[PDB]
């Protein structure tokens, strides 16, 4: 990334804008609980997904961490934390669409998204597609 | 361009918009904060001869007669992006002389 | 001094031809030659304010007008110039002194140019103007050989109501501009 060092904590209110719709791909993965998703978590689900169905299609990772995860190294209170230990996270509130696959089979999707779900700390659901966009 | 205009717009009353054509010279006494002209002494759109500068004088005096009549005297002048030098000069000049 | 060749050349020759190659309606539509400018990138005349006046005064003759000064503004760290104290040489001439200059141009300067080949018909500003480049400033008439302490170069320009480089090309050609075809 690139901006500046540290950032605030900030609570995780209503699952408002933290939640969208299946914009790309065919299937999707939604969050049910609100929390910070770690970089290690993104990749974990990423690798898990793509590794499952070798030579997989296209895996869309809508979310994206940019919140400097702060933390102190086993001491006391001399100023603000160094953070960066775990790295960064993303504001993930219920309704969000972390991942979504395409150009692949439904079985590949259902199982993958399932596994990648375990890579996530939040309880999750798997939505198909429907037609819910915004048109006439 | 019209900086000067804004300057005297906060000065007082009785502005003297001296708009002049390439051959004409209109003189209007417009009071701001309402938008009404009092003594509007035109030039080539009035009666006078054909001598821009000299005409500027006679029209300046035209303002005088009508101005003093209504009791107006606040000589709040309005350059109107023009250089006080030639025609516009005789306006306030002859009008303030008489 | 309102009288010369290039004058009535535009009047009784170019004007009608511009009504031919394109055709118009109003006289104030046909491309009229009106603006001509000069310039000299004088990063050289930075150290030497002496050499600065020389170029200016020389110019005074070849232009038949009054030289001017236009320094820089940015800051060429690479080539010793900053604030904008140094110098650039500009001079814009119009009306008669303009016509008299162009006469010398295509009848004196251009003629005796180092392996002259004509004017590059691409140097149009995409619209209806032209921009040319010259080196030796002595190609001009009055400039004597034993007077130039440097073959200082310079570039000029010419603005016209012309909106298309085709109209411009035709105009300039009719004016008497030997365009390297």
């Amino acid at each position: 990334r690139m901006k500046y060092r540290k950032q605030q904590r900030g609570r995780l209110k209503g699952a408002t804008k933290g939640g969208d719709y299946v914009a790309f791909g065919d299937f999707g993965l939604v969050a049910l609980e609100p929390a910070w998703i770690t970089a290690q978590q993104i990749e974990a689900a990423r690798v898990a997904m793509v590794r499952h169905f070798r030579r997989g299609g296209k895996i869309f990772i809508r979310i994206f961490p940019d919140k400097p995860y702060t933390k102190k190294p086993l001491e006391v209170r001399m100023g603000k934390g160094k953070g960066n230990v775990e790295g960064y996270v993303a504001v993930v509130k219920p309704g969000r669409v972390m991942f979504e696959v395409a150009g692949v089979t439904e079985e590949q999707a259902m199982e993958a998204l399932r596994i990648a779900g375990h890579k996530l700390p939040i309880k999750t659901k798997i939505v198909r597609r429907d037609a819910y966009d915004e048109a006439q | 361009k019209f900086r000067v205009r804004n300057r005297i717009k906060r000065t007082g009353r009785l502005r003297l918009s001296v708009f002049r054509s390439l051959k004409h010279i209109y003189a209007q006494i417009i009071d701001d904060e309402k938008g009404v002209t009092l003594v509007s002494a035109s030039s080539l759109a009035l009666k006078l001869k054909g001598n821009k500068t000299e005409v500027a004088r006679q029209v300046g005096r035209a303002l005088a007669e009508k101005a003093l009549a209504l009791g107006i005297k606040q000589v709040a002048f309005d350059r109107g992006p023009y250089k006080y030098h030639g025609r516009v000069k005789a306006l306030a000049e002859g009008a303030r002389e008489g | 001094p309102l009288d010369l060749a290039l004058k009535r050349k535009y009047y009784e020759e170019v004007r009608p031809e511009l009504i031919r190659r394109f055709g118009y309606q109003n006289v104030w539509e046909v491309p009229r030659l009106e603006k001509v400018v000069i310039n000299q990138g004088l990063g050289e005349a930075k150290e030497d304010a002496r050499i600065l006046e020389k170029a200016a005064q020389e110019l005074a003759l070849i232009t038949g007008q009054k030289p001017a000064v236009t320094r820089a503004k940015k800051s060429i760290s690479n080539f010793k110039l900053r604030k904008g104290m140094p110098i650039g040489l500009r001079v814009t001439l119009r009306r008669d002194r303009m016509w008299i200059f162009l006469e010398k141009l295509l009848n004196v300067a251009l003629p005796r140019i180092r392996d002259f080949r004509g004017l590059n018909p691409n140097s149009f500003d995409g619209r209806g103007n032209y921009n040319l480049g010259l080196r030796e400033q002595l190609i001009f008439p009055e400039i004597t050989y034993d007077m130039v302490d440097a073959l200082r170069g310079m570039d000029i320009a010419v603005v016209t109501t012309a909106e298309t480089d085709e109209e411009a090309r035709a105009l300039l050609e009719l004016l008497g501009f030997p365009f390297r075809k």
């Binding site: 001399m78 100023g79 603000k80 | 906060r10 904060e33 | -």
Partner: protein
């Protein structure tokens, strides 16, 4: 560390409001730049301080491009 610094509160903003009585010289509004322009019987100084030049009530008048002018309507 090295961050705990801050110039104390200057306490600017709107000092007087529309529909208020004012003497002569009452600092209408102290502003940073020029978020509020003068007008009818109102002038400013070095720090762009807005104050009354007459005696009456304060009034506001938003004028988009022009600006958010504020005046005072004299009466007695």
């Amino acid at each position: 560390t090295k961050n705990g610094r801050d110039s104390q509160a200057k306490r600017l903003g709107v000092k007087r409001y529309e529909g208020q009585v004012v003497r002569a010289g009452n600092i209408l509004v102290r502003q940073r730049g020029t978020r509020f322009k003068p007008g009818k019987n109102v002038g400013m100084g070095r720090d762009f301080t807005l104050f009354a030049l007459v005696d009456g009530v304060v009034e506001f008048q938003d004028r988009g491009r022009l600006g958010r002018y504020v005046h005072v309507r004299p009466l007695a």
